[PDB]
Every structure is written in structure tokens, then in C-alpha cells.
Amino acid sequence: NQCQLNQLQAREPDNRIQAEAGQIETWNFNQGDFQCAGVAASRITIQRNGLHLPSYSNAPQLIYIVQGRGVLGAVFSGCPETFEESQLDRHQKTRRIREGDVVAIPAGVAYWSYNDGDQELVAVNLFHVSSDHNQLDQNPRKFYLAGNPENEFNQQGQGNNVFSGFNTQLLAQALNVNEETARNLQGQNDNRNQIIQVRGNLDFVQPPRLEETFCSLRLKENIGNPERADIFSPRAGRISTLNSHNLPILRFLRLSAERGFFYRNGIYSPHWNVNAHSVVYVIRGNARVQVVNENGDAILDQEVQQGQLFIVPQNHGVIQQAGNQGFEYFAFKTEENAFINTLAGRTSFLRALPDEVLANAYQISREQARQLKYNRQETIALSS
Amino acid sequence: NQCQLNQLQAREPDNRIQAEAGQIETWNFNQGDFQCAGVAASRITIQRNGLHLPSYSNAPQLIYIVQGRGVLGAVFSGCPETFEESQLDRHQKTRRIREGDVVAIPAGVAYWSYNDGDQELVAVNLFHVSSDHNQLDQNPRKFYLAGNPENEFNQQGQGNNVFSGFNTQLLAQALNVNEETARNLQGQNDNRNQIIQVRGNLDFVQPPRLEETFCSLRLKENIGNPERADIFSPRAGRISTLNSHNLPILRFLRLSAERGFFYRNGIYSPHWNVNAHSVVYVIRGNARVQVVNENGDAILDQEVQQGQLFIVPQNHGVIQQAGNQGFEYFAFKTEENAFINTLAGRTSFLRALPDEVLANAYQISREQARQLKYNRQETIALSS
Amino acid sequence: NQCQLNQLQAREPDNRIQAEAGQIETWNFNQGDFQCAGVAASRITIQRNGLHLPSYSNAPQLIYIVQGRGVLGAVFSGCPETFEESQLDRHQKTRRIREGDVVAIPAGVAYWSYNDGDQELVAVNLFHVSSDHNQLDQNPRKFYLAGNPENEFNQQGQGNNVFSGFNTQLLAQALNVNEETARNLQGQNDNRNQIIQVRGNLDFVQPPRLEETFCSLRLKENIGNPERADIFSPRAGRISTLNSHNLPILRFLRLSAERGFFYRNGIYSPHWNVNAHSVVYVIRGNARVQVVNENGDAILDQEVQQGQLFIVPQNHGVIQQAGNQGFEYFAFKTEENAFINTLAGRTSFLRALPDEVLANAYQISREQARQLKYNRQETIALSS
Amino acid sequence: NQCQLNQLQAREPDNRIQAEAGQIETWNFNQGDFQCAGVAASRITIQRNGLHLPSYSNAPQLIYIVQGRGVLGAVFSGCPETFEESQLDRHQKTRRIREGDVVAIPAGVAYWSYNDGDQELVAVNLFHVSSDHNQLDQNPRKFYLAGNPENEFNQQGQGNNVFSGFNTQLLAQALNVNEETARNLQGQNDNRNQIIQVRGNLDFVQPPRLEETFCSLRLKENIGNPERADIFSPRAGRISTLNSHNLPILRFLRLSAERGFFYRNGIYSPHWNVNAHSVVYVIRGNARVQVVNENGDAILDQEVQQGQLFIVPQNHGVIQQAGNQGFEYFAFKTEENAFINTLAGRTSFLRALPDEVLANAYQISREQARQLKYNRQETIALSS
Amino acid sequence: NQCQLNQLQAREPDNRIQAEAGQIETWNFNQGDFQCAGVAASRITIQRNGLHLPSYSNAPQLIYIVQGRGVLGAVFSGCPETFEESQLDRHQKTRRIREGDVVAIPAGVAYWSYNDGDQELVAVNLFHVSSDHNQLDQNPRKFYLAGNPENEFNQQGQGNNVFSGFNTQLLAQALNVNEETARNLQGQNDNRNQIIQVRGNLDFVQPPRLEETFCSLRLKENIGNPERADIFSPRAGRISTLNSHNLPILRFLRLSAERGFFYRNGIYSPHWNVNAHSVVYVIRGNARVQVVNENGDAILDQEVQQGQLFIVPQNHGVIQQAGNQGFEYFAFKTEENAFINTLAGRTSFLRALPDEVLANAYQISREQARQLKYNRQETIALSS
């Protein structure tokens, strides 16, 4: 079945589609690779003044912002628009997003982004198409609510928004507005695609200078900056973990993530994901990576590079050593409080087995066993 | 896979089987239609004095009573028979069921109904064959505990009750009762099928005129009568929603429902199911319906009629306008607190996006946008 | 301290206050009685066309409707007004209440009732002043949002609404409306008290003929009618239980109730509340009642009568036998899924102990023990 | 108020009451000591062939069996009996209890014990009178269902069973058995008290040689034998912890315990209970103990001895060193997964603070700090 | 009892105690004021290079950082030190804290802070002494683990650390280090108090440039910056809410908070806390505030100023209008997802009541009612 996969390899996005203000690059979600993990990925790049048209997909997704700064508007139906002009324009809460930020967008929730900044806004998007939250099918989809976009995953048969599917007249009556308006929602005459170029400066109710509960839930946490590292050692690297104990939404979404940075040839201690698949995106730098399966065979043994995406199947063993430039990456893990069990370090599996059992298992000195055990610093992020 | 379905259409039951006292009509659970939603449906009609023989299925089911009234007997193993004659006959709690009632029967739970009333008792039954509570397979089944019924779904190969599967002698010993009686549990000589005709009036411990906890959980709620609507507008229609916040069992069953009534050509605001599939049953009246998918294509654009059953896949857009007689329907939704996100009304998605983003997306007047937003009454159930 | 109470006695309300359209009767919440259980009670009577001005208390309360028919309007802040006129008047969901209905009103939630019916609408109100939901103090309070009511519990020092506490001018500015009306609202010149007489017929958006989730939670269940009994025996009586397995709100409120009806001298089997206090209201009929404490002393041994209110402290033993007219009552229990352990019946404590342990403890025949065990019908509700 | 207690001291029980077969010793629950922790304790001793009459208390209790063996019969109302002569005598599940066993008895649950063994059955019982499960008052109580026992806590005013509280005639009618048998139950003529001597051998449905769920929940776990230690070091001692992760009932009971054994002058590393009070019972051996409060003052600095009971208030610091005979004890902790934070060892607080912060706080060598951190073996249970 | 409080007033801290590097100011926790809400507050000010000695209290607390920057070290027992030097110094996770940050410190958890910055680090601390997490008594306490501090709350009788309570010799043995170093911990010769001045620069394993789960839980969220507002309107103010939907730890702690900023005389719409007490700390600016109780009496009607602390009891009505300089404040709310019900605005209670009920209650025009309802902008934060 699914994961008895034979060969693994890290790659860049297999596609690309241009839009008036930027492009979207996608990774084929068909490869024995992705499928096995039940994940789908794309890399959005929004040019300055770019507005990613509002959309929503049958799959929940975690969004790691690679670089840029910018605004994200999420829509939660049945909630009050809390941002409004005074004494007009009123809309739901606006969220400032930036490099290192991880954003969570539940399935069926519509959102729109906008590159308010000065540089290209870039972010990879990870969809959990096998999430219990998707009842459609193994295929990821993006239902647009505006414009006439080009299919991103859903490749022509495998366009238009959902409004365009209705009987223009009826819609208009529903909305209670002349057919012209609606001729317009449907955007059959819109030739721009997903991301748009805006008339000068985009402007709304920004705030520099009830449902205090549900409607105002947190959708993001920044795990990019060093100050927020959970694991760390000066000449090795730093690891930041993100889960239910960190961001509430992850609990209802059974999803966690990680963002690490390994220094001049450091080592991400040999470990094996316990309860989850680990889809990785090399943010910057080299890293020799070996992934082994049940039969000790290295299902993957190459040097992953910046811009590539690779996968560490659940329970498989994974070793990693940074290049000279170090290793920066983002990991999307397919389970709630996802965790790893390391087998080389201060919290290694080996250090948990009694002495003689170590020996008797490897046919080694009572001494050598000790060496295997206590010949190290901190498990996870070991220095050369 | 499953839901990349191409054409959709609303239909009446594809089968039917006669019984001494009434009949059962089923909808083929094979259609790319049903399958995708993981649902199955049948429509039971019990003639006065009719007793639906006790049974149970691998799938949980919600039962909406179309018309009639009568008694439903559920059996919860390990519970005490709390209804008994005094100072004999004693059985487990009896439930009066009636038009508009929605009944929840967990998988593996045996139940029997009886038309105590004066008119034909009619109800459609919705089975969630893809519920995590079913570990058999995509196929729905009904295990009978009495009589010699005809297969309802399970079509001859794709009869008898489970008792009839045992070694009569052994069974008898187990029950501790002569072979002749036991032979009879197995009803090989019973030629009546599922619903029976009773000897005159059926009598038990009825009540006109411990486990106070578990054994006495609520199995039904009536969402038919107007007084219990949750959403409502005089010249549009009234919507009643049913979920965990309403009936406890739905929590453990990840299932919710809806029963609506739209008046003289009213409009069920264009919306999209967020976290669930919506299987609909036209209780009475016309309604033009349009369902669209990821590619703006109207996977279904027809006028649904009374007696028909149609499906609105998760995340698909759905508009609906009542006929002259209005529209009465029952919806079975494949998730716990299932909800919708409307895109035309007082709680529409549009009213959530800031002004300029509306314009920039549809290339429209700062005014027109406002029109799109505030040119309406209550979202959900809009008037002509 | 608290429950080492000595003498118990059932009584009628100790007060009363008249209103333009009806009165409210209260039971002193100071008696060593109430206090011990952490409960408070009042009995509202609304004359036809009576409107109980909107209010809210620091304590959650369960409301059992003794007789009448009418409308209850609850307000959940942050929710959308889903009941509105079409194509004006718009308000939050309206709920019909009627005899036998039990209504749950969380602490801090404002509500208003109205006697739409033809007869006096009567209901007793049970407040759990020791609920973890009240952080004020052992004293129950009612914050009014309209009119100039008389203190119901809070006896002058131990009037006006909360609006009347603000600086009229400021209030007006906040509301953005001329001082002349903020005065009003305030209501210093209103001489009617809590329940009002309405101008002819009160009309709103009634419905004969989103937040489908939270905002539309169930607030009531009718445990009065016989058809909904959970325990029942023809010549004894019928018991209906109400808890988390029946009504979701009770879970978040750790509160359950019970409504019984015992026929011509029947017996509510000798039992002891396990995890809760049981405050009882005699809806109609006689009943000899005996309550015993840790020292086998009958802390209460009298014949409770209609209109009275009496208390059965947690763990105490309580026997009960109906009069000739029977016994109808409403019980308010201070815990979630509250239950009882009976010591005389088909589910008695005695029937759980082995034979010899029964004998050796009561110094009785191996036979007599059997008699104690199996000389009965259904535990709970025994016949003479 | 409550815990600003000044002086502490470990003591033996304070009372005692004889009864036919065995005796019960109690510790005054009034001392500023107990009260503060909301606990109460007694030490039951049952002579061979002794049967502790069935009873139940408003407080949940954990029972550590000091030594012996025997049978414990708990009664769960509404449950089927399932122990029982085959095709008579039938009763609810019987539990074999033995030295080192910890038994959990929820409040309001009736139980009876019987010394089946050859030696005196001894156990201390810890009641959590401040448990949210007791709504009576700070006073612990024991409602007897048989015999004419003497008050154990509830000292005459501060006897008989609850049956003895009813109108003999009425009771009899309820039970449906002649007045003669009834007056039995009430036992006014029973002069034996709590624990009884049985007619030769006691004998039921023992088993040497549905509700598979609730009715069969686990009520005990043995944390006495060494093989089940959770923390351990050869020349120090062994600690066994008991909580939600070990026994399900503790979850619903917010209660955990501990059973330790310290060898020839070993040290229970200086620690402070984080989320709970720790009531200790010296099973055997000496141990110098010091307990300190917020002001560094040793609220208790003595040598606790076998049979004594002492208390470690929440958050207070506690050091302990075994005598020459070692130290065996049982700890009752007032919270769910109760835990401790040690400040001297391999998991000490100190080892968690960075070096310089250690120095700067104690004004010590960068070296000395290291000494404080890494000059040890395993935290908890340190060797001399 | 507790909250039948008569007079309310906002004040500055009632005490102060100097330390080598900064001071701590406390508010008397005895005032009928605080007690009623079960809260305690102090204001710590740490001079540059100041190290607040590690401590822990029986009460959980939320810490709002008023200004400054700095490092907070929390210690979770049984967790691995994940921050360590490579290929020595190793300590548990260090957290960078800053102005606007809200930090959560569970009861019984030790922590230490350090002013790494250039300006005085200042923060108010709110203790929930009535939290179910405190089993000692209504009195807040701070158990120090280093130095010889002065009592902060616990006023001499109503000093030293817990180490100082042990028998120096024994402690030493436990720690396994010469008596000289031990006495050193106890710090009887330390004359500095809580906050210390450090030797030049303090410096550990900082990171600029397993238990990925529990041990790495989030303890802070910044609700100070404008970008993170949940409610907002340009000429009124901005409100930011913080609860379980934002920070995980608040769930296990039943605590939420708020940080608002009202512009040139804006209005915090008249509302009433539904399920919580609201303790407020004026960060900067004026604000007229009126708090009314059950009897419409304004238990508090003054102009609160910067540095003051005032209290809004649960269910009481509260209006607020900013000065000319605006109003900045931090609110500590005594419940989990704490929420308010407003009575003037777009989400007001009034807008939920039908028209005629509004009229009939205030004796006003069908029109005036409409005015009361729809004569506004966004509920919460209204503009002049």
C-alpha cells in the first residue's frame, strides 16, 4: 500500500502559474512521496501591493512565512465585524503576518492576504489532505470566492469562482443587487488570476497607534526568531517546536510544526518521528540527509538544498548534518503534539537502556556501552 | 477518487420491498453520489398497527419522521428494564415518536418501532456508513433479531435473522427452552418480512396519566414544528438546526441535522457547507437548486421535488429558491456541530471583507461594494 | 458547620412582592436549611399579558414551569439577532415555554418572559448560589436591566436597574441618544416593579407557520408529560430524570433535575442521594417524607404538601409515600449527572451484597436475606 | 486563616472504639493540622473472620492496606450483579485486597470488607473532606447500612444505621417483608458495632479456579511490592507513585498517593509539594523530618516514628532521612496527578538555573555552583 | 458575606520594600475590595542589571509587563535542561519578556527574572488566591529559593528562604557538598532582598543568532502592541483579549486577561462582566469610571488615574470614558474564557430584545426603541 515507498528525493515545486501580482508554485501531490504522508504543498510569492484573492480549501493548512511582512484577513462566519471606522467601512479582524510566522487556516475557512511591505512576500503552504477534516477525497482543492483564477492543484479535469456557478439573476436577487453587479462577482471577464495588483495603496481599518472568545482565536505564532527557540546550543543550532501547548488551534486540527536553524555543520541528532510524518522545507543552506526504513535501507540519502521539499515518513530513522552555510528549515508534522525519539544524545533511547543490555545487544565492552551513552552533550542539535 | 464526481441529480428511492404491514424503500448506496458523502438512505412506511421488527446496523443513523406518530423501542444492553407492571410484563424505556422528530440510533443498537397512530407512519433513515463507528466496510447492513426479512441494502449476494444462524439445539440450551420455541427465534417459517401486522391492539407498559443517567439518555428532538426554529423571517422561511448544543448523543456520533421550511419563493442564501456533507430530503414543495464545485461548474442545477433526495458535497456552493408552494426539507449532515458559511446576507462572507478588498477583487465601485455588503436583511432565508 | 443541621421542615415562600402584572414569592435563603445545599428559590406568577422585565443573576438557575404557556427571551451577547422582519424589527431567538418545561439560565445571562397564554403563568426558580459560576458571595442577586423593581432577595440593605447607576449624560452619549431617554431606561419614575402589564397584545417576530451552533443552544426540555418518563410502573408512579445525557447546558453548570408523579399512595423507594443535594417542590399532592442523617435520626419526618419546598441533604436517607391524591414534585439537584442509590428494590444496595453478608449483618435467616433482596418489583417507584 | 499554622507534630491515632471483631482508631480531624489539608484519617483493624459492616461516607477516601488480606465488596447502584451461583446466591463483584494495595472508594459508595486471611487485617483510611465531592460540610461522616455502630468521627452530638431512621412499618412495606424482619435491619438490638465476628467461615460466590465497562472499573492498585517502584536506587530507597496515569478513578477524584521505602539512613531529597498537601503515615521505621514554610521556619522538625501520621502542607519544603531500620510510609496527596519539585539532585530546581544565576544568588564560586548542581546521583531517594 | 461591599475606590500600592536592585510594591489583599474577587497584586520594578531571585507562590499569577525588556527563567521540575553550551553551563529554557507581554506562572512553579535592558523593567503581578490551585488559604505567599528576602504580602507574623529551614548538615549531605557552601544557600548573611545587583553582565546560554511538548509550553503572549488588537475603531480605542483560544495555559488556570487603549475621550461601552471579576490597572491616562451593583447604586464613581488599581465585581455594570490623554489599562479576569455582555452598541443586549418589549419596558416610542437599538457604531469602544 501507500508507504511501502522505495525511492525518495528532495525537490523544488513541479509547477508554477503567473498572476497579475505574483505567482504560485505547487508540488505534485500525486508522488508516492506526498500521498503516503497525506500532505500537499505550494509556494506563494506576492509582489508588493499584491492581494491574494479570498479562498478556502477542504484541507486545513499551516503557512510558514519565508520572508516578507504583510496582512492576512481570515473570515469566520457568524462573527461580528469588530474592526470599523467611527461615528462606512467595517470588516472582521485583520492580522499582521511576517517572516517566521506560522499561520493556521482551518478547512472551509476563507482568507485573503496582502503584501503591505516593501519586498516580495513569500510563504510555503502545507495542506493535510488526509486530515479527518476533509471529507471530499485525497485531492486538495481551493474554492475561490473572487476573480477568475487558474487551477493550482486541480489541473483542468484531473475555471471560475463559486459565485460564477450560480444563475446570475437568482444570485443578484439573493444579494439584492442589479445583475450587473453579480455579472461581476462571477468574474468571467476577470483576466488576472489568484493574486492581484491594487489601485495604489490598499486601505481599510488598520490599527497602528463581542466574542472576545471564539471569534478572536489566535491563528499564528512566530517560530522563526532565535529568541523563541525551545532547544539550543551555540555551536550547533536551535530548534523551535510548535504544538497544542503553544497554539490552541493545533489541538483541533491535530497538527504541529517545527522551525530549526543548524549552524556550520551541526547535527540534528539521529532520531525517528514517533507519531507523525515530517514534511520539510529547506529555507536556506545545505544538509546531508539520510532516511531509513524498517529494513535499515536508506530510502533517501542525499544533500538537500534551499528551496527543496523532502519527507521523513513516520517511524523512519533520520540523520542530518548541516553544510558550511548551516541549515534553515521548516517542518510540517501530521499529528497533534508531534514528537521525536532520538537515539544519540543526552535524551537518547540508548541512554534509557541499562548497561548490560546495551552490551549484550551490540556485543561491546561494558565500557563502550557507557561511551555510547554518556559521550555527548544535548540530545537534538549536536555540535561537530 | 471518491468526490471528483461529475454529474448530480435528485431522485426518489430506487427500490422497494413489501411487508405484511407496510414497505421499505431504499436509495442505491453505490451511486458516485452517496458514496462520496459516505451516506445511505431508505424510507420506511408502516401501516397502522404495524410493528417494525427489532434490528440494528453497523452504521449510526438519524431518523426524521415525515408524518405519523407511534412508539420506538431502543435496547441498551446492560441496562435495567425500568418500565414494568406493578405488584408479568417488564421492558426497557418506550419512546413516543412523531412527525418532525429526529431520532438517533447508534451503531450496534437494536430498535423496533410501532405505528400506534391512525395514519401511515413515514420516516426516511440516514446511515453514516463512513462513520468511525463502522469498522466493517463501506456497505450498510441491517442485522435482524426476529422474523425472516428480505435484504434492504445487502442485495442477495452483493436471508434470515442472526438467531437463525445458530445450531437450534445449542441456542435452545443457551436460552434454556425447548427446541420448538427456539425454532422459532429463527423464523425460517415466517413469511412476513421486516414490518408486521399485530393481533388487534399492541399492549405493553405504556404510560399516559437506576441509571437515571446513561440508560435514560435522550434519543430524539423535534425540529419540525415552527415554534422551535432557530432562524426565522415571516416572508422567507424558518430554519431549525440540530447538534451537540441541542442533543447530547450527536457529540458521540459526529452528526448534526437541519429541518427547514421556505415560504413562497424564498431564498436559502448562497452558502457553502464548511465542515460537512449535506444530504437533503424534500419533504414537500419545489425549489430550484444549484450546486457548484471548485471549478465554478454547477455540478447540479435542477428543480428538486417532494420525495426526492439530493446531495450538497462539502465546501461546494449551494443556492436555493423555493417554488410557489414553498420548500420543506430535512438535511442530514456528516459532522458534529456542522455549520455553513454564507456569502450573501447579514452574516455573509462578503460583509467580512474590508471595502477596498471587495472592490479590488471584483473591479467595482467603492459604492457597489457597499451594495454587495449591506443590501440585505438576515443572512440565511432571504425574501424575494 | 454548614450541614450539621438539626431540624428540617417543608414550607411555603416566606415573602411576596406585588407587581403591576403579577407577583414574585421568595423563600428565605438564610435558613440553615437552604444554605447547607447552597440553593435559593422564588415562585413567579405572571398574569396574562404580563412581561417579566429582562434580568440576570450571579447564580445559574433551573426554572420549572408549574403551569401556563408563554415566551422566554434569552440574550447571549455577541450573537446575531436571527429573528427579523423581512424586506424594522429584529431580535434574538424567542423560546416558547410551557408547563413541565425546565429552563436553564446560566449566570450573567439576561432573560425576559411574557405570558402569551390564557391562564396565570407560574414557575418556581432554583438558584445554585454555591455554583462555581458565582464569585460574588453566598448571597443571590438579580440585576435588572429595566424598570424600577423591588429587591427580591437582596432585602433593602441586607432600588433601581444598573442603567440608573450611570451618569445619565454619559450614558446618553454612549447610547448616542438625547438625555430625555437615557433618563427613562434609567427608570426612576417607573412605579410598576419586575412584572409589567402590556399595551394590548405584545407582538414581535413570532413564528407560527449564523451560529447554528453556540448561539442556538437548547435552554429547555420538558420533563412534565408522562410520555417522557424514564422510570415507570402503572400503579406506583413515573419518574423522569434530566441531566447532561439529556440537556447539554447542564454539563457546563453541573446541575440536573427530576420531575416525578407518584400515584395513590405509591412509594419512592428508600434511597440516598449519592453526589448531590435534592431540593424538592411539591407541585401537587401529599406525601409522608422522612429524611435521616449519619446518626439514623430523622432530621425530617412530616407530611409535605402542595406548594411547599423541602430539602434532602446529600447522602442522607429518604423514604416517601404518596397521599391519596398522589404526589407530584420537582426536584433541583446540586450536581451534574446526579444520581441516587436505592436500598429497597430491584436495583437496591441490598440486592448487591452476597447472601451471607446480608444475614451476618442483620442476624437473619438465609431465607429472610433472600426476602429482603427479591421480595419486590422495580426499584424506585414501588406500589403499595 | 486555615494554614497559617504555627506548630506541627506527628502523632499516633487519638481515639479507638472496640467492636466485636476488631477495632477502629481515629485521628482528630479538628487539629489546625488536618483541617488545613482538608483530610481525615482512621486505622481499621479487623480480627480474622471479621466483617466490616457496609457503609459509605460523604468524602472520597483512599485506603492503604498496612497488611493482610481479605475481601472488599463495593456496591455500585444500577449495576447488574454478576457474581453468582450457576443454575440462590448472587451479588456484585468481590475484590481481593492485600498489603500494599491502595483502594479508592468514591463518596456515597457503600462498601464492606472481610478478613478472609490468617492474620489481623490492618489499613489506614484517608478521607478528603474538602473534596469537591462533599457538599455537606467540613465534617467527615460514615452512614452505616447495617448494625448499631458507634460514631467514629461524628462524636455523639459534635447512634444507629439509616434504616433505623425510617418508620419500621413503612420500610417493611417498601421492602415488602414482615415488620419482624424489618426491625432487624434497623438493628436497635444489635450490640456489636462496625466490625463483626462471622458464623464460622464466610462464604459467597468466590472465584478461585454486562457493563464490562463502568460497573467493572478498577478500584485498587498495589504500590507496596518493590517490583512496582517508579524510582529506585539500591542503597537509598524505592519510590512508587500512584495517579491518573496509573488508576483511572483518581482522575474523577483529583487524588493521588505514594508508597515509599527508604533504606538504612537514605535521603528523600529536599523538595516541595507543588500542587498538593501530603499526609504521611509511617508504616515502619524512623526518619528525621523537617518541614519549612514561607518564612524559612521549620514548622516541624522531629523524628517521625512507626504508626504516626504527619503532614507536609502544600508548597512547604520537606527534607527526610531514614533511621537505621529505614523508613516505610504511605502518602495521601490532595490533588490529581500530584507532583513534587526537588531542590537537590539530578532533577533538582538548582540544576535548572544557569550557572551565574546560581552564583549571583548565593554569592559563590563559579565552581561551587557546579558542585551544587552536579554533585549527586538521582534526584529523589539519595544515598548517605 | 464577601461581596456585599459598600464603597469602592481606585488606589496606588499601599506598601513598598527596597532591594539592592529595585523594589516591590504591594496592594493590601485584605480590603473588602480585593478579597471579594480573590485577587492579590504587587508592582515589581527591576533596575538595570537586576535579578529577581527565583521564587514560587501557592497562587497562579498573570504578569503584565508595563515597560522594559528582560529575561524570565521558569523551572518545570522533571524536565531536561535544553539550553546548554557545546562540546560547563546548561539550564532550562530562557524566555525574553517585553512591554505588553502577559506571562503565566502556574502555582508552585519557580521563576526568576533579569533586566537585561537599558531602562527600568516594570510589571504588575496578579495572583488568583482563590484559584482552585491554591489549597493553603486566602493568604498569598512567596516561597523564595535564594537570598534573605523581606516578606511581601505575609507581613512579619500576619524571614529567609526554604533552604534556610533545613538542618544545614543534613541539607549539605543531601546536596552532597561541604557545610560552608550549604549555609550559603540558606543565606542568613545575605542582606539584599528579592532583587539583586549582578556582577557586571549576567550571562548564560542566550540565543541570538526532548519534550518538544509539555516542557516547552508557551507562558506568554504580547497583548500590548496595536497590531494585535481584537476590537478596534480609529477615533475610539482598541481592545485586545487573551484567553484559552489564545494561550493554552489559561485553560488549566481558568484565567483570561485584557489590554486596552482608549483614545481622546472614547467610551468603553456600558457592559457587565458575565462570568468574572475584572481587576484593572491604569497603565496611563484618565478615565471616569462608574460601577453599579444589583441595586443600581454606583458602588464606585470616580476618575481613575495612572498607577491606580480598581475593581469591577462580577455582573456589576461598568461604564468608562477616557480622558484627553486617553486610557491605557490592563485587566486581570478571574475566569477562563471570560467575557462581557454590553448594553449599548452593535452587539448590545438591547439590540437583542424585540422592538415592542423595548418600548413596553421603558415606556417609549416604537421609534425611540429603534434609536436605542440602531443609534451606534461598534459595540465596545464607542467614539465621542
UniProtKB/Swiss-Prot annotation, chains A, B, C, D, E:
Keywords: Allergen, Disulfide bond, Metal-binding, Seed storage protein, Signal, Storage protein
Ranges of residues in domain Cupin type-1: 8-183, 221-370
Residues reported in the UniProt entry to bind Ca(2+): 95
Cystines in this chain: 3-36, 79-215
PROSITE patterns: 11S_SEED_STORAGE (PS00305)
Domain of life according to the entry: Eukaryota
Tissues in which the protein is found: Expressed in seed (at protein level). Expressed in seed.
Post-translational modification: Proteolytically processed from a single precursor to produce an acidic and a basic chain that are linked by a disulfide bond.
Motif residue range(s): NGXEET: 210-213
Quaternary structure (record): Hexamer of two trimers; each subunit is composed of an acidic and a basic chain derived from a single precursor and linked by a disulfide bond.
Family statement: Belongs to the 11S seed storage protein (globulins) family.
Name of the protein in question: Prunin 1 Pru du 6
Organism: Prunus dulcis (Almond)
